[PDB]
Ligand SMILES: OC[C@H]1O[C@@H](O[C@@H]2[C@@H](O)[C@H](O[C@@H]3[C@@H](O)[C@@H](O)O[C@H](CO)[C@H]3O)O[C@H](CO)[C@H]2O)[C@H](O)[C@@H](O)[C@@H]1O
C-alpha cells in the first residue's frame with residue numbers, strides 16, 4: 001500500500017507526514033519537501049528522469065538557465081537559443097580579501113541568437129532526448145519547433161526546424177569572412193570565430209546585416225578554433241552528421257589496474273553520404289590520457305580556451321582514454337608508531353560523540369565516524385568497543401532502512417521515500433536540498449554505504465540481500481545506477497564526459513551545475529568498492545572502480561591543477577573549491593574561513609583517501625599556500641584535517657603540530673571544531689599521522705592484480721598493504737614483481753590485536 005519491502009527493510013511510496021520535532025525554523029521545514037512537480041520533457045522521454053546533469057536547467061525551468069556545452073555557453077529563451085563564447089576579454093579573476101574568496105569567471109553575454117523564422121515566442125523548451133553527455137532541447141510553439149542538439153565536448157550545435165527556417169540574429173553586424181553559399185565563416189564584432197552550415201543549394205542571405213537567414217530546415221553552428229578556411233573545410237565534413245547516440249563504455253582490467261573508456265557517437269546524416277562521426281572537443285583529463293590508438297585522430301592545432309583550460313579537437317566516431325585504478329583500503333592498517341594506550345584512550349573518548357543533526361548528512365557524518373573507529377578498535381585489541389561501534393551502526397541503519405513503524409504505519413523521520421515523478425530515493429530528514437533539489441545523494445548516501453561496508457567486513461549475514469543488503473543496494477542504485485534500471489536514471493551523479501560528479505540535482509544556475517566536495521564524491525565511490533567487494537558483487541564493484549578512477553582524473557585537473565596548466569597565473573590559491581560548468585570559485589556553500597576552502601576537498605579521511613597523495617609537489621605547494629595565508633600553523637578551524645593532509649609529504653611536521661595541540665580541548669564539543677573537525681576524531685587523527693610517519697609516501701607507480709590494496713614508499717623501501725574480504729586466502733601480485741599471501745578476512749600486515 002504505502003511502502004515496498006526490500007529484504008528486512010522498506011521504502012515509502014507515499015510522501016510521509018513529516019515529524020518536524022517541534023522545529024519551527026522555516027529553512028528546516030522547507031527542506032522536508034519534494035523536487036519540482038513540473039518536468040520540462042517531451043513525451044519521447046519516459047521513465048526515471050536524469051538529474052545532476054550539466055544541462056539540468058532545461059528540464060527544470062520553462063526555458064533554461066545558462067549552460068556550458070564546452071566550448072560554448074548557451075541558454076534557451078522564448079526568442080530562441082542564445083549562443084556565447086568566453087573570449088579572454090570576457091574572463092576575469094577577482095579576489096575579495098576580507099571574505100578570503102577568489103572567483104575565475106566569464107560573462108553571460110550573447111554572440112548571436114539561433115532563431116526560427118516563424119516565431120520568436122516559443123512557449124517552453126523541453127528535454128526531447130539525451131544520452132551519456134549530449135542533450136536535445138526542443139523549443140515548442142504548436143507547429144513551430146526548433147530542436148537543438150548540443151553537448152559538453154561538442155564544438156557543434158545541430159539545429160532542426162519544423163514549419164520554418166533558420167535565422168541568426170546579432171546585436172552588431174558580424175563579419176562574414178567566408179561565403180561559400182550554403183556554408184559561411186563569420187566573426188562577431190569582437191572577433192570570435194564561428195561557422196554556419198546548411199545543405200548544398202540553400203544559400204545564406206543578409207550578409208553584411210545584423211540578421212543572417214537560410215531557407216533550410218537544418219543548420220549547424222560550429223565554434224572555430226581560428227579564423228581559418230582550412231578549419232572551416234574540416235568542420236564542413238561533419239557538420240551534417242547529427243549526434244543521436246553517445247555512450248561512454250568502460251572496462252576494468254583487474255590484472256593491470258587499467259580503466260579503459262571509449263566515447264562513441266552514432267550520428268544521422270542530414271545530407272547524402274555524411275560520415276558517421278563528429279569532431280569531439282576533449283578536456284585535459286581526457287587528452288592527457290588518450291589511448292595510443294586514438295592519437296592519429298587528433299586535429300593537432302584545433303584548440304579552444306575554456307574555464308577548464310585548453311580543449312583539443314579530435315575527429316571520428318570514437319576515442320579512448322586509459323587510466324590507472326590505484327586500489328582502496330577499508331582502513332589504514334596497524335602500522336603506526338603510536339602509543340597504543342594513548343590511542344585506546346582516544347577510542348574510548350569517542351563514545352562521547354553524537355550526531356549534530358537528524359538529517360541524512362549530519363547522521364551520515366556520525367556513522368562515517370563510527371565506521372572509521374571500529375577497525376582501529378579491532379587493531380588495538382578493543383574488540384568489545386569495536387562491536388559497540390558496529391552495533392550502533394546496525395541500530396541506526398536498521399532504523400533508517402525501514403519505512404514503517406511497529407504498527408505498520410509510515411514513519412515521519414529516519415526513512416527513505418521513492419519520489420516517482422523524477423524517480424529518486426529521498427531521505428527524511430533532509431538537508432542541503434537533498435530532497436527539494438535532489439542534491440548531494442553521493443555525499444550523503446556515501447556515508448550510509450560506509451557504515452554498511454564496515455558492518456559487512458565483520459558480518460556477511462547482515463549484508464545479504466534478503467537482510468539489510470537489499471536496501472543498501474537500493475541507495476547505491478539511486479546515486480550510481482547501471483543502464484536500464486527500472487527505478488533510476490543511469491549513473492545519476494556522474495558526467496562521464498566532464499569526468500566528475502555534479503552535486504545539484506536541478507542545475508538551475510547561470511554557471512551550470514557545480515561540485516564542491518570532490519572528496520565526498522570519492523568517499524562514496526570508495527565505499528561502493530568496499531561494499532561490493534565484501535558482498536561479492538563484481539559488476540557493482542567495477543562500476544565504482546570506474547567512477548573512482550575517472551573522478552580522480554578530473555579532481556587532479558580542475559580542483560588541484562596538479563600540472564599547473566589550467567588556473568590563471570594571477571589566481572592566488574592552490575585549489576579551486578567549487579567547480580562549475582562556467583566558472584571556478586575559491587569559496588564555500590556556507591560562510592567559512594581559510595582552512596575550509598581547502599579541506600572541504602580533503603574530508604573525510606578514510607582508506608580511499610590515498611589518491612590525495614599521488615602528487616607530492618602539489619601537496620607541498622597547496623599546504624604552503626594555505627600556511628602562508630594563515631600566517632602560521634594556527635589553523636582557523638579543522639586543524640586535524642590540515643595535519644592529516646600535511647602527513648602525505650611531511651609526517652614529522654604533522655606530528656609536531658599534532659603533539660602541540662591535539663589535547664587542547666577534551667571530549668566531543670559540537671560548538672568547537674578548531675582542533676577536531678566534527679566528522680573526525682582524535683583517534684582517527686592519531687592513527688592516520690603515525691601510520692603515514694612509518695609508511696612514508698603513497699606510491700602510485702605500483703599496481704596490483706586485486707582491488708583492495710595500497711603501496712607506500714619510504715626512502716626507497718616499499719610497504720605493500722592488502723585487505724582480503726574473502727573466506728579463502730589469496731595471493732596478490734604487484735606490478736614491481738612483489739607477491740604476497742593474505743589470510744581470509746584480514747590485512748597481510750598490521751592486523752593488530
Ligand atoms: O562548524 C559549524 C558550521 O558547519 C557548517 O557545516 C558544513 C556543511 O555546510 C558542509 O556541507 C557541504 C556542502 O556544502 C556540500 O559540499 O555537500 C555536503 C553536504 O551535503 C558538504 O560537503 O560540510 C562541511 C563539512 O562536513 C560542514 O562543516 C554549517 O553549514 C554552518 O552553518 C555551521 O556554522
Ligand SMILES: OC[C@H]1O[C@@H](O[C@@H]2[C@@H](O)[C@H](O[C@@H]3[C@@H](O)[C@H](O)O[C@H](CO)[C@H]3O)O[C@H](CO)[C@H]2O)[C@H](O)[C@@H](O)[C@@H]1O
Nearest residue numbers: 431432433437439440503504505508514515516589590
Ligand atoms: O548546488 C549544490 C549545493 O547546493 C547547496 O545549497 C544551495 C543553497 O546554499 C543556496 O541557498 C541560497 C543562499 O545562497 C542565498 O544567500 O539565499 C537564498 C534564498 O534563501 C538561498 O536559497 O541555494 C541553492 C539553490 O539556489 C542551493 O543549491 C548545498 O548546501 C550543497 O550541499 C550542495 O552541494
Ligand SMILES: OC[C@H]1O[C@@H](O[C@@H]2[C@@H](O)[C@H](O)O[C@H](CO)[C@H]2O)[C@H](O)[C@@H](O)[C@@H]1O
Nearest residue numbers: 509510511512578585587588589590591
Ligand atoms: O559559487 C559558489 C557560491 O555560490 C553562491 O550562489 C550563487 C547564486 O547566488 C547565483 O544566483 O548563482 C551562482 C551560479 O550561477 C552562484 O554562484 C552562494 O551564495 C555562495 O554561498 C557560494 O560560495
